[PDB]
């Protein structure tokens with residue numbers, strides 16, 4: 001159904017993520033910290049993201065880092081697409097971090113999120129999460145690298161009731177072998193796959209925030225709710241992305 005390519009990055013250049021395509025988040029949203037009790041700051045430096053040899057790397061590092069008076073013990077990157085879209089098929093081919101404590105994600109936020117320091121501000125609205133909606137195409141927690149997560153977080157348009165549900169699936173060699181993490185999203189349903197396996201399908205409806213533009217996020221959080229305990233010896237780890245493609 002989704003046969004027209006509308007956004008892609010094949011990462012076949014060298015240096016910073018293409019600034020026509022990617023926006024960095026660096027300002028923490030919660031008084032000097034990220035959410036979910038996560039332990040990193042996110043930066044735009046070559047320490048934490050770079051493109052080389054046909055692939056994007058996001059790299060989390062145990063490193064003391066201070067931003068605007070708030071010191072953390074880890075650094076990473078959190079990218080947002082400067083493409084916003086309503087419906088489509090998103091495909092991201094990647095290798096995931098292997099190390100305990102890492103929490104990689106490939107996900108979306110409604111573009112009316114107005115999250116601090118994002119790219120779209122109040123252009124589309126001002127719907128504080130979860131009312132803006134989100135789709136998790138991929139997460140892994142810190143303690144089980146043999147499973148992936150797909151999940152949805154939202155409140156219905158006629159509600160302040162927060163909903164959150166999804167599924168998981170087994171994965172083999174998530175760090176050493178590329179897999180394709182994908183979403184097929186239309187007015188009827190949102191389906192998340194790992195290669196050809198359906199991880200979760202949620203029916204769409206007008207009562208949901210999944211009928212207006214979303215943007216993509218790519219990140220590695222450290223610690224926090226799904227990162228869990230980080231080994232004392234942690235040095236650094238990479239989330240390597242061969243491409244992002246979006247079709248409509």
Ligand SMILES: OC[C@H]1O[C@@H](O[C@@H]2[C@@H](O)[C@H](O[C@@H]3[C@@H](O)[C@@H](O)O[C@H](CO)[C@H]3O)O[C@H](CO)[C@H]2O)[C@H](O)[C@@H](O)[C@@H]1O
Pocket residue numbers: 035036103104105107109115128129130134135136139153
């Ligand atoms: O909106 C203010 C509200 O924010 C809540 O923080 C949420 C985070 O819980 C949420 O975490 C993401 C997960 O839902 C899941 O989508 O996967 C991603 C990637 O792993 C997680 O980051 O992210 C949204 C958007 O940044 C935050 O708004 C606080 O918990 C809550 O107290 C506060 O009111």
Ligand SMILES: [Ca+2]
Pocket residue numbers: 010011012054055241242243
């Ligand atoms: Ca590539």
